[PDB]
Short mmCIF file of C-alpha atoms and ligand atoms in Angstrom, two decimals:
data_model
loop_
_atom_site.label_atom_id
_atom_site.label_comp_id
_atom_site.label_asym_id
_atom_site.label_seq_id
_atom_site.Cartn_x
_atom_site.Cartn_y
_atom_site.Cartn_z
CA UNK T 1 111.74 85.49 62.62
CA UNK T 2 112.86 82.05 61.36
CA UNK T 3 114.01 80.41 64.87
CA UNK T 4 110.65 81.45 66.51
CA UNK T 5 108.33 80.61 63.92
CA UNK T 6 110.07 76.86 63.13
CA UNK T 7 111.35 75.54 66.33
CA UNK T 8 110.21 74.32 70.05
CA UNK T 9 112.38 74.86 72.89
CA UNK T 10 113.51 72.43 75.25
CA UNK T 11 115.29 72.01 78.06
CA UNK T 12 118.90 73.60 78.35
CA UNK T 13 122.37 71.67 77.69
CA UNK T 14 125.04 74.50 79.03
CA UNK T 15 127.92 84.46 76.42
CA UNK T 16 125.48 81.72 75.43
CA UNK T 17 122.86 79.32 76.24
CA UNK T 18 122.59 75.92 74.28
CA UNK T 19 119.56 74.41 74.75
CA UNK T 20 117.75 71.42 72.65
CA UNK T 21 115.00 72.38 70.25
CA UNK T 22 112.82 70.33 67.65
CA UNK T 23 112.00 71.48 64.23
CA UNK T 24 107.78 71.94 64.12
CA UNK T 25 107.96 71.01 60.44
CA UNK T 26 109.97 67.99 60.43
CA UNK T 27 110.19 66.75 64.47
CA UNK T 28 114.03 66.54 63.93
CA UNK T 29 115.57 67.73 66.86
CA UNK T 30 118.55 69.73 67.36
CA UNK T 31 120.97 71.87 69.60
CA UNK T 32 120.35 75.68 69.45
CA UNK T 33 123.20 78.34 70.98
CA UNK T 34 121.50 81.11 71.56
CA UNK T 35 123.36 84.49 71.54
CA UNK T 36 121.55 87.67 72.38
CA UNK T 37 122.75 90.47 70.34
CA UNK T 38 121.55 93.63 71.65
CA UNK T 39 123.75 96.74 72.34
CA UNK T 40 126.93 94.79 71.11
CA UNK T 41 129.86 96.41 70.34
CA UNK T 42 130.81 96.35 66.55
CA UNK T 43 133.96 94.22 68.02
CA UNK T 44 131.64 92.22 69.49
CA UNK T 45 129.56 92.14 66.00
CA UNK T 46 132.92 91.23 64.45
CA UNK T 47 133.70 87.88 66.73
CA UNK T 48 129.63 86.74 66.19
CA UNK T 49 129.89 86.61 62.57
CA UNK T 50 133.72 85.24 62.87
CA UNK T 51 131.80 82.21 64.91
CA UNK T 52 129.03 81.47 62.63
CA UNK T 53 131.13 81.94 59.49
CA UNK T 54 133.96 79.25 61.06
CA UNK T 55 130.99 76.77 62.01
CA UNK T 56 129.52 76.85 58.40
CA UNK T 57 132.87 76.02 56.59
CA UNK T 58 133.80 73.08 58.80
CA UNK T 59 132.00 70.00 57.98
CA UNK T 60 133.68 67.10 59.17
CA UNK T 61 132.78 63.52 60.55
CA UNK T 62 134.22 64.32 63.96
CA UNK T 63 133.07 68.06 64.39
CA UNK T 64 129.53 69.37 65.04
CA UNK T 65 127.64 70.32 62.21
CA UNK T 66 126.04 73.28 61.62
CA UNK T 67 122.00 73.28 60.15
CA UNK T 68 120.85 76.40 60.05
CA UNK T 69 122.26 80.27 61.28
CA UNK T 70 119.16 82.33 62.40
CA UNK T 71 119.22 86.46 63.07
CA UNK T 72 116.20 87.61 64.91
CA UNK T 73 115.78 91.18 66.81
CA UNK T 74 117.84 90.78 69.91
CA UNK T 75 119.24 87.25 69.69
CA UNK T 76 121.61 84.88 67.28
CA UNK T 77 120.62 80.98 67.24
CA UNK T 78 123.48 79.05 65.45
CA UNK T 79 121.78 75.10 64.93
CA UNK T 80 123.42 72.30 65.11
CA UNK T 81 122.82 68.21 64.56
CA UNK T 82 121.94 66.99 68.19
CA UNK T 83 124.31 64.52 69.49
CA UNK T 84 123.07 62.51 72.53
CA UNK T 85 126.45 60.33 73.35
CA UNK T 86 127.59 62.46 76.73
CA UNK T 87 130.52 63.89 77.35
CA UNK T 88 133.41 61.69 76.06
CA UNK T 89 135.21 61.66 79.53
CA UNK T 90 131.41 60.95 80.93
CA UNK T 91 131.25 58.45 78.70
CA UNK T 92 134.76 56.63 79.37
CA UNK T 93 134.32 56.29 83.10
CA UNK T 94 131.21 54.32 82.55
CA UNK T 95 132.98 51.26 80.37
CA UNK T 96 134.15 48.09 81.92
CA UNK T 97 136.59 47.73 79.99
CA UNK T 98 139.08 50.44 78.36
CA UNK T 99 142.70 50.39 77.71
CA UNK T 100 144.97 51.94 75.37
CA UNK T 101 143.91 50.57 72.19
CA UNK T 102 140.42 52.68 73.37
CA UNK T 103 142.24 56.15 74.43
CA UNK T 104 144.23 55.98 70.80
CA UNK T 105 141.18 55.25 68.80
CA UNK T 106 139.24 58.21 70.71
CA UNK T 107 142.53 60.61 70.53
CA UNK T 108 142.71 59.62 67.00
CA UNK T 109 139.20 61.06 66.18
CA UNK T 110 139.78 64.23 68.07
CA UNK T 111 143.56 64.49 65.93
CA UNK T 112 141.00 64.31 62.64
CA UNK T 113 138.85 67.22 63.74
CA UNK T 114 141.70 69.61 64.91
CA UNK T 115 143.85 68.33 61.40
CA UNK T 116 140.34 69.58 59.59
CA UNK T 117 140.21 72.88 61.35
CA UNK T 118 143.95 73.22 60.55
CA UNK T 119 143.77 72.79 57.09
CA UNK T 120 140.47 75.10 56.76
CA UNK T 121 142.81 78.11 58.79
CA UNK T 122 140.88 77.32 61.93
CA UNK T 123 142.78 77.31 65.28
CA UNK T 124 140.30 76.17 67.93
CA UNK T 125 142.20 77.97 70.93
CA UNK T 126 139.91 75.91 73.39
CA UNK T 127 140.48 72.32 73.23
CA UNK T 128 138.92 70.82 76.30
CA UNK T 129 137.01 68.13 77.77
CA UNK T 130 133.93 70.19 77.96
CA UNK T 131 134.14 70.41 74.46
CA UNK T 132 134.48 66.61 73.48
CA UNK T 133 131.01 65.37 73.24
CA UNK T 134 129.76 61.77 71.53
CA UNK T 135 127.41 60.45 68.56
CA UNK T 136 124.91 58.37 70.29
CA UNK T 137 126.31 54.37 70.13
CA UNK T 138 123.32 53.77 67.74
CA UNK T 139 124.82 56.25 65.66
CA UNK T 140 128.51 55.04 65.85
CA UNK T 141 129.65 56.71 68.72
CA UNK T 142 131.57 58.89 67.02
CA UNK T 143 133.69 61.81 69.23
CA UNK T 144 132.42 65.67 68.42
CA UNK T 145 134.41 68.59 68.69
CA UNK T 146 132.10 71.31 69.32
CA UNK T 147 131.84 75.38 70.30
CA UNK T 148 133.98 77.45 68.15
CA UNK T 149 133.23 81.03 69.75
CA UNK T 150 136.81 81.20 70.84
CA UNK T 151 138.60 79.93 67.52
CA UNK T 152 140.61 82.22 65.03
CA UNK T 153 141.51 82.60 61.24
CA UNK T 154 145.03 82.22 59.79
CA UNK T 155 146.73 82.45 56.84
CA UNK T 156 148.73 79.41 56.14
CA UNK T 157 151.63 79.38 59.03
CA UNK T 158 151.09 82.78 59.65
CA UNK T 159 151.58 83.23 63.74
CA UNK T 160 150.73 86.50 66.44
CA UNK T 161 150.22 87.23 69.30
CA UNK T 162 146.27 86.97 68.94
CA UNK T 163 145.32 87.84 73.00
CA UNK T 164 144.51 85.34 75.83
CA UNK T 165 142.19 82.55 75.32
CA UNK T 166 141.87 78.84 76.53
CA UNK T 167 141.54 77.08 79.69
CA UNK T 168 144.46 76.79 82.57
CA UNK T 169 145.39 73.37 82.75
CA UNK T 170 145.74 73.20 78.92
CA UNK T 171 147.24 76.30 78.19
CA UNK T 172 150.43 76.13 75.90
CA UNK T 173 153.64 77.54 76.87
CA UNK T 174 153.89 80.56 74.11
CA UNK T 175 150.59 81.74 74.66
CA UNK T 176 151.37 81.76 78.43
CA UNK T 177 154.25 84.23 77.55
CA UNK T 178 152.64 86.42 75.50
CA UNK T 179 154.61 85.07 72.43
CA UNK T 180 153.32 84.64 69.09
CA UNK T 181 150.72 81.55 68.39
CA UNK T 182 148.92 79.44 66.13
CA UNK T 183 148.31 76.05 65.29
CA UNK T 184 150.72 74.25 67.50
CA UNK T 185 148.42 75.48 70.46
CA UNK T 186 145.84 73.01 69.52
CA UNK T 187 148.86 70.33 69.53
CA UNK T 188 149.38 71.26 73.05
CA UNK T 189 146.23 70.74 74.57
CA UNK T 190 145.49 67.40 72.52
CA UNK T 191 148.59 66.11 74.46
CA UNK T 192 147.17 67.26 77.75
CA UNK T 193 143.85 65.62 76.74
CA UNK T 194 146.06 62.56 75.69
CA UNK T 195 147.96 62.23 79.09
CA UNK T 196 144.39 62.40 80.90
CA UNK T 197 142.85 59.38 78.69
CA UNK T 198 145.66 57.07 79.72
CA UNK T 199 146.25 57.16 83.70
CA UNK T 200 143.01 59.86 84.56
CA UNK T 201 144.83 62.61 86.06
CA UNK T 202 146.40 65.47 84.30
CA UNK T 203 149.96 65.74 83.28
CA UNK T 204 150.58 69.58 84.83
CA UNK T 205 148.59 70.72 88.11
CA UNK T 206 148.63 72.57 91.12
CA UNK T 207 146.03 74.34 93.38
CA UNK T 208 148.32 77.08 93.18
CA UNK T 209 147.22 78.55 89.83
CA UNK T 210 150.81 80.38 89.17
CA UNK T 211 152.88 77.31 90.09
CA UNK T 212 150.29 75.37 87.24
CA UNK T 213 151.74 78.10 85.13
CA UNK T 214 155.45 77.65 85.80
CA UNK T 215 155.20 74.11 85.56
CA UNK T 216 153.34 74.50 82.20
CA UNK T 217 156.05 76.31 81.05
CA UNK T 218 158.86 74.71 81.83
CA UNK T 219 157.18 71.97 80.31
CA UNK T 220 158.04 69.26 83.70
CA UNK T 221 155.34 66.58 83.07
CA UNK T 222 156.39 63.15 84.11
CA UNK T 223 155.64 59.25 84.01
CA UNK T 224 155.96 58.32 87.43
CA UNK T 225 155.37 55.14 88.57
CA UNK T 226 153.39 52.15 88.82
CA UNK T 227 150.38 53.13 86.39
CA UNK T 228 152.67 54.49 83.38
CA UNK T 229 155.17 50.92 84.11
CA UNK T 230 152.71 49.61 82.08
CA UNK T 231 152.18 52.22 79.70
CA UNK T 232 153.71 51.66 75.80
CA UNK T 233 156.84 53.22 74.85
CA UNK T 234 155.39 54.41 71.72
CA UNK T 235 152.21 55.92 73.59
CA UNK T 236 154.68 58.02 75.95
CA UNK T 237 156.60 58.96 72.93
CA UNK T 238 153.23 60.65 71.44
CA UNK T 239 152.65 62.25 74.40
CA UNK T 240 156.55 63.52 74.21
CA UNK T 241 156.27 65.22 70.42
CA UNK T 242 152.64 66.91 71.40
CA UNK T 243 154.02 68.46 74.62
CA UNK T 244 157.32 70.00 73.63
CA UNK T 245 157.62 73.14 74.85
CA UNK T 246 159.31 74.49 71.41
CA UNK T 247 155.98 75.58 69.14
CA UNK T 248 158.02 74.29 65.82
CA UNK T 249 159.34 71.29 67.09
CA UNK T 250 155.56 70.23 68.41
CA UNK T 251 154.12 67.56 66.01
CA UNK T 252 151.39 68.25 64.37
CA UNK T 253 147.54 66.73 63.50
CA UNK T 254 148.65 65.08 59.95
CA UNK T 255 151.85 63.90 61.65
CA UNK T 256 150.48 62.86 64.78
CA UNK T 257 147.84 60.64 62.64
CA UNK T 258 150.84 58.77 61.51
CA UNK T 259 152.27 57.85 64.34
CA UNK T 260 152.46 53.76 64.98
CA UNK T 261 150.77 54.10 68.36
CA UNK T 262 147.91 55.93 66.31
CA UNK T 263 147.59 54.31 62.72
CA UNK T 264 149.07 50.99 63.81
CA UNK T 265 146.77 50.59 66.90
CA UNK T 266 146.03 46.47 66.96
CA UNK T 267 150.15 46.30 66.95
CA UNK T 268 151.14 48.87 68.72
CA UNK T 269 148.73 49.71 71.36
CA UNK T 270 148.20 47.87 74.51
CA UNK T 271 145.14 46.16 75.06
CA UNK T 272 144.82 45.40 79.03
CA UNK T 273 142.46 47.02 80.90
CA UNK T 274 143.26 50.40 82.90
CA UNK T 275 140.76 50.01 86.13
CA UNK T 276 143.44 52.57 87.58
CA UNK T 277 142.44 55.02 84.94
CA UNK T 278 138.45 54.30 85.12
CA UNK T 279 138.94 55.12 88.82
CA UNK T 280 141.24 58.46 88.17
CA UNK T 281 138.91 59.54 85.89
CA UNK T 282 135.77 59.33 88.28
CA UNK T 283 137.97 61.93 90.42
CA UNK T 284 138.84 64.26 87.39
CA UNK T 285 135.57 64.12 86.36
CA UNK T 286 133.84 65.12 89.82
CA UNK T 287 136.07 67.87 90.35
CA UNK T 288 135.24 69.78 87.21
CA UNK T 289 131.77 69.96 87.79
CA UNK T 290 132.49 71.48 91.70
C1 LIG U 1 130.38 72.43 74.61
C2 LIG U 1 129.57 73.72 74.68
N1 LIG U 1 129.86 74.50 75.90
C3 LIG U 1 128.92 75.62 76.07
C4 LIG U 1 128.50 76.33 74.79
C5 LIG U 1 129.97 73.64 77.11
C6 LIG U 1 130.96 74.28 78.10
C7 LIG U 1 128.62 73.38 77.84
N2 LIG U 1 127.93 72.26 77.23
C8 LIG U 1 126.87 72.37 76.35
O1 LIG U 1 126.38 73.43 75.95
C9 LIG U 1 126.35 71.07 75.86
C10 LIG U 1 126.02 70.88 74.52
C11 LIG U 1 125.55 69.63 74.14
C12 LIG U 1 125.19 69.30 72.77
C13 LIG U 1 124.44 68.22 72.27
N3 LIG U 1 124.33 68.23 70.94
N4 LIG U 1 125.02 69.33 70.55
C14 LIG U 1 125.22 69.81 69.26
C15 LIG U 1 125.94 70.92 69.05
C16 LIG U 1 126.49 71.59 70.27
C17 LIG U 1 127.28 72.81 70.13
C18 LIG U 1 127.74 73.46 69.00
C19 LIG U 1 128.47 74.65 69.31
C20 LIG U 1 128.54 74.88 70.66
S1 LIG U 1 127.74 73.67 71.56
N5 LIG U 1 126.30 71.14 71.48
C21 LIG U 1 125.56 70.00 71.64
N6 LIG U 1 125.43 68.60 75.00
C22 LIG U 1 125.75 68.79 76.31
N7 LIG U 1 125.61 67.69 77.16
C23 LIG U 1 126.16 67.54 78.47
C24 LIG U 1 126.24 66.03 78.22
C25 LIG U 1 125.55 66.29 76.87
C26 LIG U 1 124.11 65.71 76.68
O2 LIG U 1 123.84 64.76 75.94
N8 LIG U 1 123.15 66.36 77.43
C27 LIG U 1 121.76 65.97 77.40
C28 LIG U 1 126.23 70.02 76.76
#
């Protein structure tokens, strides 16, 4: 009787409902998923307590942290910090200035949260711009990787075919052939959600649903030109090792963070602004939302 007792509900934020909520005691306020629990299946059970179990382990600068897990009759609250950035992508088409040096310091936050869930046996499954949200700037503006309902446990390197899960337009190639998965899914959509922050449009598409899938996995992305002319080698060449279609030759979080384009940023990185981008991104943005 915890959640009801201690906390005020607010206004919603997006199986679930998150909605903001202040604690009476302390007038902290936070974000509360609310989960309601009756006549679940024991599978379902199963993949509740998988959620709130993975969300208590990972604590990490660039993940959303978990304050408090609260079982009442009929409903699950998991509570988190409140972060009041935005959206990243929100957040990105609202800067006057943005360039590479920008998209590799945001992709290199995101690499630290999926390396973290790696190395904890956490696979996220759903990496997505939904999914990205922001510190406030008073805070540090720091980028959050949030919602684990859909991530899995592994052991080590072991890899299965763990069922369906993730969003179209960043779904990997093995998991769109039924093969075995893990990890290197996670690799997949980060370089989706790479090729997006540098020209605003993303790298495989079609309003045909089953040519987006044939595309996906014959792995046919491209730099055409002129926005990529103007694009770094060594950013490309990121892009390249995060979407090869081979799971074991896909680089992964700790390698990615030492690539030069990533750890070498003021050298490598371009700095001129991408107005091209900041105007793509308006129209990826838009169409998301319907
Ligand atoms: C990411 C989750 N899922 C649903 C489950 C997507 C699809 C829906 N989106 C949300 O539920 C949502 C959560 C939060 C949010 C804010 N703090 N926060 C802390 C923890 C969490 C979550 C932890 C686990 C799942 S959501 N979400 C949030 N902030 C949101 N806003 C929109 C801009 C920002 C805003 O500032 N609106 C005043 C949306």
């Amino acid at each position: 009787t915890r959640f009801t007792d201690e906390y005020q509900l607010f206004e919603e934020l997006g199986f679930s409902v998150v909605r903001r909520c202040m604690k009476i005691p302390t007038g902290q306020e936070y974000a509360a998923k609310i989960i309601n629990t009756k006549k679940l299946s024991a599978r379902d059970h199963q993949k509740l307590e998988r959620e709130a179990r993975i969300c208590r382990l990972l604590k990490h600068p660039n993940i959303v942290r978990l304050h408090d897990s609260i079982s009442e009759e009929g409903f699950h609250y998991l509570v988190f910090d409140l972060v009041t950035g935005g959206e990243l992508f929100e957040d990105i088409v609202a800067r006057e200035y943005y360039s590479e040096a920008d998209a590799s310091h945001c992709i290199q936050q995101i690499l630290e949260s999926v390396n973290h869930c790696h190395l904890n046996g956490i696979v996220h499954r759903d990496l997505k711009p939904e999914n990205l949200l922001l510190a406030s700037k008073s805070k540090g503006a720091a980028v959050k990787l949030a919602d684990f309902g859909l991530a899995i446990e592994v052991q080590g390197d072991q890899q299965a075919w763990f069922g369906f899960a993730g969003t179209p337009g960043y779904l990997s190639p093995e998991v769109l052939r039924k093969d075995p998965y893990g990890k290197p899914v996670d690799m997949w959509a980060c370089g989706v959600i790479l090729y997006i922050l540098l020209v605003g449009y993303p790298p495989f598409w079609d309003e045909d649903q089953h040519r987006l899938y044939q595309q996906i996995k014959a792995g046919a992305y491209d730099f055409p030109s002129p926005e990529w002319d103007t694009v770094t080698p060594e950013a490309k060449d990121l892009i390249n090792k995060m979407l090869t279609i081979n799971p074991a030759k896909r680089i992964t979080a700790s390698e990615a963070l030492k690539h030069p384009w990533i750890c070498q940023r003021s050298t490598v990185a371009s700095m001129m602004h991408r107005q091209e981008t900041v105007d793509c991104l308006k129209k990826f943005n838009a169409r998301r939302k319907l």
